[PDB]
Amino acid sequence: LQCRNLQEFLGGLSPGVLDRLYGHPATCLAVFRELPSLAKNWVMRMLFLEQPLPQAAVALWVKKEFSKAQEESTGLLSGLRIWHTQLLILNPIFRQNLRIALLGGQLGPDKHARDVPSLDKYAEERWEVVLHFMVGSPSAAVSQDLAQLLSQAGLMKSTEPGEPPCITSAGFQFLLLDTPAQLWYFMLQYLQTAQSRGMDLVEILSFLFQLSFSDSLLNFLQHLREFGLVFQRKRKSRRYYPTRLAINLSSGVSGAGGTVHQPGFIVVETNYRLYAYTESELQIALIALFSEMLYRFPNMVVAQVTRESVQQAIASGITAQQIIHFLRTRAHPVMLKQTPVLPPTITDQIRLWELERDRLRFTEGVLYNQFLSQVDFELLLAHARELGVLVFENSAKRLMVVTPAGHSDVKRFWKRQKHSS
Amino acid sequence: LAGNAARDNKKTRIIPRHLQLAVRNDEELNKLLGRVTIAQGGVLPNIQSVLLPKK
Amino acid sequence: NVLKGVLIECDPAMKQFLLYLDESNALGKKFIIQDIDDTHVFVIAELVNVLQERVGELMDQNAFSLTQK
Amino acid sequence: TKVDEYGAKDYRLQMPLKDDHTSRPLWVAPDGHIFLEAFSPVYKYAQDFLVAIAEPVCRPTHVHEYKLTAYSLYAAVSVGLQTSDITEYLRKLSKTGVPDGIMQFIKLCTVSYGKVKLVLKHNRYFVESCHPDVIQHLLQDPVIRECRLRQTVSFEVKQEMIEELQKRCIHLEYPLLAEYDFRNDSVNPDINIDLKPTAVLRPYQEKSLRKMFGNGRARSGVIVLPCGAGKSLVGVTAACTVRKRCLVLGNSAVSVEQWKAQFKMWSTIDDSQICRFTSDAKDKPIGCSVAISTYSMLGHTTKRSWEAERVMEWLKTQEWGLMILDEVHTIPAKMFRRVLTIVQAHCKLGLTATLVREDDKIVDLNFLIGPKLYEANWMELQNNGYIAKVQCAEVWCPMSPEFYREYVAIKTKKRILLYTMNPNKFRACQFLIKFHERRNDKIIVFADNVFALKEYAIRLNKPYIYGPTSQGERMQILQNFKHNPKINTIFISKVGDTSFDLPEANVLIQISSHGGSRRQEAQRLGRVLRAKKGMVAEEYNAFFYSLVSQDTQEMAYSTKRQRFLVDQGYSFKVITKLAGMEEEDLAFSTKEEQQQLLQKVLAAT
Amino acid sequence: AKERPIWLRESTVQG
């Protein structure tokens, strides 16, 4: 369930929710700025049109080239039900709220006006302690809601009743992701689990859009403070200040650049040795997931990337891609000079170790043998292929294997075929 | 409940400990036998959250 | 007839080792149902864990034990 | 002692981080390990200083690794560095200070020098110490009194027991000084030999000599230099420096010939003044001052020939100012080490390109000869162009199924042959050869097992070379390969890597090796390190390929064997497959060919 | 002339 982008969530929306979600304060601005470079023009054009137009016009207004992108963007906006063909008339609520959004249409005593660096530092701090709890740290910040949240997010599982929760296959993969992507998956799971737990996604999600620029919102907002995404000096203040992370929100690494705008620290040697100029134990814990740590200094740690530690990581669920990415995104300024930044021998070795771990591909299936004829065999094979139930075939050897579920269908068909007698 | 606790402890015989854990882990048996002391049974593994280690 | 089990596909070197394992009765049981292809065989679902373990063991038998050396 | 929740050793309770740690490029671990930022602005000074005070462990491109050792500390004192001097500069370089455990460790190793000195005079060996009382406590063990023969106090020691005593002196915490004042020595006559100005001395060579000749007295020890780095010239230069009667010992007659040529090539000495004391050839050694021989001759355990006995007695009675030992990795051998007890030498200098061996006897060189006087950074030499840039690679040849079936079935030594001979490894070599041959590249093929060597070379219709091949046939092939354009590859057995003077080649393919041994690997690579007629270091003109059979013991041996090369910094690029091998016409294109070879392979019985 | 071969130019591992 690697929901790497907003588009997957956008498809997970029905008209009965889209219409309410299409509020005037933030959704229109957030949605419009997220639409493709093409559709944004047409939506803005028809913002003053009360009468639909034929698809041929939109089609002829684009060259033969880029027509696929226009079709794809048309598929999205039609999938978003932003307009109706009625033959592309915008939805009245969407048009009206977009119109009001252009101009708009609340105040009180001054706040503590805490410095933006301070806000982003404790936000990063808050996310770090969340990850410190996520990793196998002997001590970390905890909270019943935080724990169950990470658990319902599929990141952690409790092996025994009363024992501390441990990390799942997805959790290990998640831990290595970059902060924005890592935060994104968390936000997405919170949103999904919110509607699941009865929190109105409409209001909280619209609120997330507003932060990027009721009791349900207050409860939700309290969690956002606990996530460090918003600052509130005291629980009594009716006003809050969104942190950089909350402002970024669903902008992704494309907005204001990736998290790579940070000091690099991992050095990778051709002898699989790692030197990470770091004091933050979270980085150490992550490095320990796939490398054998040797020595720790006040500002640096020495480790080695072995078959044991890597194949252990792969066995736990990690991939060489995530490892190579984790290193590359953290590579120290000194090794940035060489190209590629990581030594090819290292990258190739890591990939080759994971590829060894899956030398054998295991697949459940049911095998039929001793087909009395090539005709009925190929006939049954064609049916298995028509059903997409086929797993593997060797017509020369007159054999095929099918998925156990699909097998019941060929079992039924085989019996039907045999019962024709 | 005692046999379950024994199997959970990977043991083949129910001993006083398993009886104590079975009696104290069940909400109703614990209430029925609240005034009862079981010889060699010990007590339930219990530590208060404030006692657990911190930074 | 039709047979329950799990298919495994791998390069023919591993496929020979897999055939060797039950041919030598290393696991004591004829876990291979049939010879599907040079890179494909069908095996009993319950033995795949020790089979995977024996493949893992074979790598260590044919790989250097770095172990901080 | 202290370990975190993770396997890494932690030292927060052991040392602090200094205020300007960012400027300081070094760390000192309480276990003696040291790290140095190779990219630091002061790296140059730190590299020299760490090579002076510590033992290099790894020297990769961004961070080098060193460890302190008594021998390396003695070498530091051997260049006049006081405990305060090394401490003060180490502390200045260390960004995390110096741990007291290391400081007190340095103290002991520093004060344990200069106290006891070993010297020989009139064929007699005397153990001298400036302090008179030290002898009384040092002699408290009868092993010394039985070793002892029946200010600056001294006593004579039984020659045959010097080896045992010297090894004891190390663990006894009183190393013997071996400085030889060849300048102030009129007892041993000087020899009329000088380095002709034709000889060119490179900086690393000059550094190693300067470190060996820290003062007017020569220091004993081992110098590690690649064969292409001109180790021979350093040896010849050392002799020209000592200007006293010297004995050179090679591991083979070919080496003895090489040394004679090098001495004539680089020194003013005439051919009559050089003798090659050898059973195969005679030059009336007693007639001249410079002698050259082999460990097999002098170390010979069985009865000597009457004529060779004459020279050996003359050799035994004469005192050698300098004793040059080539490829000293063999020296710790039970017979070869006897040579050090047979020959009387004032100072002994060991040279080798591969100071590694699979036995735990390499450390004996520290007491049999001395500490590492120098050890070239092979990556620096490539950066300086003194060594050819070799793009090493490991071709993961997949084993054939019918081979693996037998390979996994046969657990005896016979599997070494089967993993060495398979269609994929064969096809891969044939393809790489054809490609590099049509690329006009000189190629050297290396193997161990003669059976595979023959069957490969015959099927490839190429000339092989192995032990029983007579010297005339052997050299005739090398001359054809070097000069005849129609031949561009030779299949050599261990004879090529053990000890030889093979013509340089752009490419080398190793289809078989004795095992995961590092020594043979680096010896084989040494053959391609020689600079070419018009290459440049950035051209990546040199190549080295190891052919290994996937899922086999060869994989273990190969990774185990590359350890020394990766420690030096070489990148063994893995090659899973070569594009074009699918379409190039190659042998074993059908299973019947594979079966025929497999049948003959099984016929090996 | 004398350029490196493809197997030495790029990663031969499928990734």
Show the 3-state SS of D57-100.
EECCCCEEEEECCHHHHHHHHHCCCCHHHHHHHHHHHECCCCCH
The C-alpha atoms of residue D32 and residue A240 are separated, in whole angstroms, by 54
Binding-site annotation: residue ranges of D for ATP: 225-232, 527, 530
Question: Measured between CB atoms, does D551 come within 8 Å of chain C?
Answer: yes
The closest alpha carbon to A292, from A300, A282, A302, belongs to: A302
As given in the structure block, the two tokens for residue D209 are 């000599």
- What are the phi and psi torsion angles at A345 (to 5°)? -55, -45
Residues in D whose CB is inside 8 Å of some CB of A read: 4-12, 15-17, 21, 27, 29, 33, 35, 39, 58, 60-63, 65, 96, 566-567, 569-574, 576
Q: What single-letter DSSP state applies at residue D180?
A: B
The chain A residue lying nearest B46, using CA atoms, is A162
Question: Is the separation of the CB atoms in A138 and D4 below 8 Å?
Answer: no
State how far the Cα of C26 lies from the Cα of C31, in Å rounded to an integer: 11
Phi-psi region of D554 (alpha: psi -120 to 50; beta: other; left: phi over 0): alpha
Topology given in CATH for the domain delimited by C2-63: Alpha-Beta Plaits (3.30.70)
C-beta separation of A407 from A389 below 8 A: yes
| Contact between chains at C63 and D555 (C-beta distance less than 8 A) | yes
- Cβ within 8 Å, pair C24-D409: yes
Cβ contact A52:A85 at 8 Å:
yes
Q: Identify the chains in contact with B, defined as 3+ C-beta pairs within 8 A.
A: A
Write down the experimental method used for this entry. Answer: cryo-EM
Token pair, residue D348, equals 């002994």
- Can you say how many angstroms the Cα of residue A113 is from the centroid of all Cα atoms in its chain? 33
| Burial of residue D68 (number of CB atoms within 10 Å: 0-12, 13-18, 19+) | buried
Sequence-separated (6 or more) residues with CB below 8 Å from residue D596: none
Residue D450, classified by CB atoms within 10 Å of its CB into exposed (0-12), middle (13-18) or buried (19+), is middle
The two tokens of residue D62 are: 């961004």
Are D and E touching by the rule of 3+ CB pairs within 8 Å? yes
Residues of chain A contacting D39 with CB distance shorter than 8 Å: 334
On chain A, the residues whose CB falls within 8 A of the CB of D8 are 293-296, 301-303
Question: In this structure, what token pair is assigned to residue D86?
Answer: 């090394």
Alpha carbons within 13 A on the beta-carbon side of B24: 16
After which residues does a break in chain A occur, C–N more than 2.5 Å?
A: 87, 105, 213
Q: Can you state the angle between helices D423-438 and D591-603, rounded to 10 degrees?
A: 110
Q: Judge residue B36's burial from the number of C-beta atoms within 10 Å of its C-beta, 0-12 exposed, 13-18 middle, 19 or more buried.
A: exposed
CA angle D227, D229, D230 (to 5 degrees): 80
Concatenate the DSSP letters of all residues of D242-293 into one string: H-B-EEEEESSHHHHHHHHHHHHHHBS--GGGEEE--SS----GGGSSEEEE
Q: Residue D569: phi, psi to the nearest 5? A: 115, 0
CB contact under 8 A, D551 and C59: yes
E4 touches chain A (CB under 8 A): no
Q: How far is CA D259 from CA D243, D291, D308, in A?
A: 17, 10, 20
Residue D96 and residue D35 in contact, taking contact as beta carbons nearer than 8 Å:
no
Exposure of A398 in the CB half-sphere (CA atoms within 13 A)? 11
Tokens 């090489």 identify what position?
D258
Residue D330 φ/ψ region, left for φ over 0, alpha for ψ in the -120 to 50 degree band, beta for the rest? alpha
Q: Where are the beta strands (DSSP E) in A220-276?
A: 230-231, 241-242, 266-268, 273-276
Helix (H) or strand (E) holding A15: helix A15-21
D317 in Cβ contact with D273 (< 8 Å) = no
What is the number of other CB atoms lying within 10 angstroms of the CB of residue A357?
18
Say if residues D292 and D248 touch (Cβ distance below 8 Å): yes
Report CB contact under 8 Å: A297, D6.
Answer: no
Q: How many CB pairs under 8 A join A and B?
A: 4
Rounded to whole angstroms, the Cα distance separating D97 from D512 reads 48
A387, D245, D343, D553 from D298: Cα distances, Å: 84, 17, 9, 39
HSE toward the beta carbon, residue A35, CA cutoff 13 A: 22
Distance CA(A353)–CA(A346), nearest Å, equals 11
Query: What whole-number distance in Å separates Cα of residue D102 and Cα of residue D174?
Result: 19
* Domain locations in chain C as residue ranges: 2-63
Q: How far is the alpha carbon of D173 from chain C, nearest alpha carbon, in Å?
A: 29
What three-state secondary structure class fits D52? helix
Closest to D503 in 3D by CA, of D533, D470, D473: D533
Resolution of the entry in angstroms? 4.0
What single letter denotes the amino acid at residue A352?
A: L
CA D504 to chain centre: 19
In whole angstroms, give the CA distance from residue A389 to residue A401: 9
What is the distance of C-alpha D421 from the center of its chain?
Answer: 31
How many degrees, rounded to 5, is the angle at CA D464 between CA D458 and CA D465? Answer: 150
* Distinct helix (H) and strand (E) counts, chain B: 3, 0
* Rama region for A398: left / alpha / beta (φ>0; ψ in -120 to 50; rest): left
Contacts of C64 in chain D (CB under 8 A): 516, 555-556, 559-560
Chain C, nearest residue to D403 by Cα: C13
Structure tokens, C17: 């080792």
DSSP string, D132-167: SHHHHHHT-SHHHHHHB----EEEEE-GGGHHHHHH
Largest pairwise CA distance in chain C: 54
Dist. CA D248–CA D3, nearest whole Å: 50
Collect all residues with Cβ–Cβ distance below 8 Å to A316 and sequence separation of at least 6: A169, A172, A289
Q: How far apart are CA A184 and CA A162, in angstroms?
A: 30
> Which of A310, A401, A414, A417 should be substituted to probe chain C, the one whose Cβ sees the most C Cβ atoms within 10 Å?
A401
Substitution target from D1, D5, D6 for chain A, most A beta carbons within 10 A: D6
**CA distance linking residue A259 with residue A181, whole number of Å:** 10
Q: Taking CB atoms and an 8 Å cutoff, what residues of chain B touch A138?
A: 53
| DSSP-derived 3-state class of residue D115 | coil
